[PDB]
Amino acid sequence: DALRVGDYTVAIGNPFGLGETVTSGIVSALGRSGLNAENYENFIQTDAAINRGNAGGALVNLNGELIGINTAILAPDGGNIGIGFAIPSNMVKNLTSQMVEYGQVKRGELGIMGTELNSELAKAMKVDAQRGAFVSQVLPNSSAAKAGIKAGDVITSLNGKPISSFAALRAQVGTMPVGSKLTLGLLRDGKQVNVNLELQQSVDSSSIFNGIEGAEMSNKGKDQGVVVNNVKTGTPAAQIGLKKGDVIIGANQQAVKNIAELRKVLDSKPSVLALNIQRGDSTIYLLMQ
């Protein structure tokens, strides 16, 4: 977060298996995102020479301290043309420290929806700042809603640090663990507002299968099967027979009471699978693979 456009950068990596290759550049820009609009990317931009194999390599300042992990480049020909991207060290510092304790990430949510603040929207909202996070709405029962965040407010700073963009702010906090206390600078009706906060906790059939989309499922009651909540037409689950409301009772002659007992035989990897779901009063069977 101390980086600025203009600082000098040293890129280290291994392009094409040649060996450890050191290259030189400067911080071209900060807070860049859009390569994969779903990813959490607050990329650093550098003209340091970076080609296939530099990925996972360190981006350091003239003192050798890690300032970013080189990730991807923009190349219409696959060769470096002076545009490299690195994940800031603070996002790595926050994501490495989460994999040390729990092996995966406790993806925390505050509870506000929004979109980017352009120059046109600040003219309509007669807000001073021309960039930041615009609160389209706040979710009810969220810690953020508990803190006093009105819709239509603009976010400008976090922990004092100015915010380059919503997708940057989303990426910055998309890494911090659940319960991280932080400070926010706001602008509602031309007034500055500061508030502290704390994360709360946050399901596809492809979050249980990998490859089977368009069927939102979960547990039912107290160990009463895996209920199918909603299914979209022509999705990898509706092609086999999963309808909305089905209560998955069992599979391959063993009972299925929840997403846990289901995964006891899924990971047993049987050749062909036979669900014993039920379409209300009827008892039907479903087959896969």
Binding site: E109, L110, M113, G114, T115, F166, L169, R170, G174
Partner: peptide, 5 residues
């Protein structure tokens, strides 16, 4: 478009 956090 919109995005959640």
């Amino acid at each position: 478009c919109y995005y959640k956090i």
